[PDB]
Design a binder for this molecule. Structure first.
Ligand SMILES: Nc1ncnc2c1ncn2[C@@H]1O[C@H](COP(=O)(O)OP(=O)(O)O)[C@@H](O)[C@H]1O
Ligand SMILES: Nc1ncnc2c1ncn2[C@@H]1O[C@H](COP(=O)(O)OP(=O)(O)O)[C@@H](O)[C@H]1O
Ligand SMILES: [Mg+2]
Ligand SMILES: [Mg+2]
Lengths: 52, 371, 371
């Protein structure tokens, strides 16, 4: 019984390690943008839209 | 270098580098040409908006999915989708990265061969490998046995696996999936007055289905309750106002999964094809499959499905066996997480289909030892 | 040093060091290669599970016994079984231990010669000796006379012995044994609806036979009773549920021993081959053989056989002689206990086949004086 429990736990732990290795590996892909605002109180362009 | 774990899917393309937790870029797989004439000059109007860009200009486009049921029906559009995925959503040239596509079970050979031929000739990858979408979902759960029901958006397939030895004679592939549920919901909404017809409004009906529908624990009791009280009627605001109220359409749309006779399909529901898939297995591994039933895929995210399915299987199965349904919270990306884990393994590093091998045997190499 | 008392048997390999009461490691002798494909990578899947490991993964294996009827039909598998027995179940290298194998009577010579050649060349033991499986069972009873019926799982043989002098002309070897009873039980279970076909389900039928079957004291009365009442129907739970109910199959399976016409064999039952074996002996030692009839082997463990056999022999034998049937509770391991006793004797210490002797005369040494 102890041997069976040990082998089952070993297999489960090995699978969990294989998963968790890549789980911790590339977890920085969550870096994205937040798109805050600044009120753009300094835009003083001219009316020359020809490019559309 | 790092491997690219792409996952074509049907409805959402999920991609990202191997070894992370979540796909880097997830976006619908639709390519929509404009349909009106266009009068402004120099506006910079393109001829086809793909990916998430065509979900914002969908008011004047005709979106059309390039993947119908697992299989790919329009190869030019699929090539366009892949090109977008590589160059704009990941910005990594494919000349320096292995790729790991995914494919549903029991699909036509020509689809897989054309996929590998494209990946090797057009994008010119170093090496690509095609894997069955259910084995990955079993990887992600950290198990090594279990019968996985991967109800995607294109096709629902049910692959049983024991001790790492897949049982090829017990795969039950059924073509009811999220898209048919969207169409059926769009068809039963007409019973209150709301008519959605345009291919753009299918997206609105999909959003309604995602946000409101749920799977009833017992169907007849819910049908009786919704017909007397009004505690179920949840309202939803269209993209222009004019809120709508969904009554007993809420649990009737996803009920089609357990009674495919609603949309005229003959076959049995996802509650009985799993039991049939188990009973085809050998008599000595049925207990383990009963105890390790795995759910995956997007469509299995309905609130309350992990209880309805367990109740149904417990009704069907012998009374002594314990029925357990594994429903991880990261169900939607389970296949891609498993793909990342598989691509990150050292033992797997020599199974890729190297380009010189393809040059020697042609595209039919995929059916050979390098599966 | 200590001697290794191995006992190949057919169905259960029993081994252990000489001088103990019970074998150290008892495990089925089956070697099963996997038969499905296998999709998980790096799971550490071996190419052949032997011994008790293949009774737990039997759901995806094709178990095949390497010993059919006493004789060995597949030498590579038998070598694998021996290697497992030495290295993993006892963990003693064979380079430092004498071995005492056991062999059924009247077996082919080539089997014995190949056995000794393997033990001397591959495992490289210091000295090995082969003994007849019935003399050991007579040792274990502490007798020195008596006729022993050793109904194993492969072959049933009946060796009479008097005052230590074996009678070679009175050995009656019959090839009906536990395996044929398992097959016949599996064949008569089909009369209720239960079909077991796979080589893995033969193990389930064997478990049914062990736990439920019993030998009827009188066959016709039991057949009449089981056909009217229902006091015999005992139920049993399969490895997945769906309990089964065994009716008059309970005492019909082991009845084949006393009527081998059930499985189409011509010969007479184990109740009449013992009487024939006695009658071939001399007229002056028949009383002692009548009084000291010994039972051994696994298959003689059926509840109620020591009474049926005594009734049958008393019917056959003359009315004056006393018929007594010795049925020790440690029947299954009787041969191995006797083997331990024989290996522990000082007088026996010079009968081993020393390696230098084998080097001088070749494998044919076993038929010579060192028997
Ligand atoms: N939260 C949700 N609730 C209900 N249904 C959902 C949810 N998310 C996605 N779906 C359905 O699942 C589909 C996406 O499935 P997905 O797993 O992306 O398919 P694929 O296997 O092609 O990647 C969508 O079309 C949608 O109908
Ligand atoms: N308790 C039991 N009741 C009935 N039959 C048994 C029992 N134990 C073992 N057997 C039968 O005896 C066989 C084992 O016999 P065994 O003495 O191990 O053979 P061997 O002589 O090869 O060692 C098994 O195959 C089984 O069919
Ligand atoms: Mg999918
Ligand atoms: Mg024996």
């Amino acid at each position: 019984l102890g041997t069976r429990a040990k082998e089952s736990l070993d297999l489960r732990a090995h699978l969990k390690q294989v998963k968790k290795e890549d789980i911790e590996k590339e977890n920085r892909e969550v870096g994205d943008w937040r798109k805050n605002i600044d009120a753009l109180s300094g835009m003083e362009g001219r009316k020359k839209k020809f490019e559309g | 270098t790092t491997a690219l774990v792409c996952d074509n899917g049907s409805g959402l393309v999920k991609a990202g580098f191997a070894g992370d937790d979540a796909p880097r870029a997830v976006f619908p797989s639709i390519v929509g040409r404009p349909r009106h004439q266009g009068v402004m000059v120099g506006m910079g109007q393109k001829d086809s908006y793909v990916g998430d860009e065509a979900q914002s200009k969908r008011g004047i486009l005709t979106l059309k999915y390039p993947i119908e049921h697992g299989i790919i029906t329009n190869w030019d559009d699929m090539e366009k989708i892949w090109h977008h995925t590589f160059y704009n959503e990941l910005r990594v040239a494919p000349e320096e990265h292995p790729t790991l596509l995914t494919e549903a079970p029991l699909n036509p050979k020509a689809n897989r061969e054309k996929m590998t031929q494209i990946m090797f000739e057009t994008f010119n990858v170093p090496a690509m490998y095609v894997a069955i979408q259910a084995v990955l979902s079993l990887y992600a759960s950290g198990r090594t046995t279990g019968i996985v029901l991967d109800s995607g958006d294109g096709v629902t397939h049910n692959v049983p696996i024991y001790e790492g030895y897949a049982l090829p004679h017990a795969i039950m592939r059924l073509d009811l999936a999220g898209r048919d549920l969207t169409d059926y919901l769009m068809k039963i909404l007409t019973e209150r007055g709301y008519s959605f017809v345009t291919t753009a409004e299918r997206e609105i009906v999909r959003d309604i289905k995602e946000k409101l529908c749920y799977v009833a624990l017992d169907f007849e009791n819910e049908m009786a309750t919704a017909a007397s009280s009004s505690s179920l009627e949840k309202s939803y605001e269209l993209p222009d106002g004019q809120v709508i109220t969904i009554g007993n359409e809420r649990f009737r749309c996803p009920e089609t999964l357990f009674q495919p006779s609603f949309i005229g399909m003959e076959s049995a529901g996802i509650h009985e094809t799993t039991y049939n898939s188990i009973m085809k297995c050998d008599i000595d591994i049925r207990k383990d499959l009963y105890a390790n039933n795995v759910l995956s895929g997007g469509t299995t995210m309905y609130p309350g499905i992990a209880d309805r399915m367990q109740k149904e299987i417990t009704a069907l199965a012998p009374s002594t066996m314990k029925i357990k349904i594994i429903a991880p919270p990261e169900r939607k990306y389970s296949v891609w997480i498993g793909g990342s884990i598989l691509a990150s393994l050292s033992t797997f590093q020599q199974m890729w289909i190297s380009k010189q091998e393809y040059d020697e045997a042609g595209p039919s190499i995929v059916h050979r030892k390098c599966f």
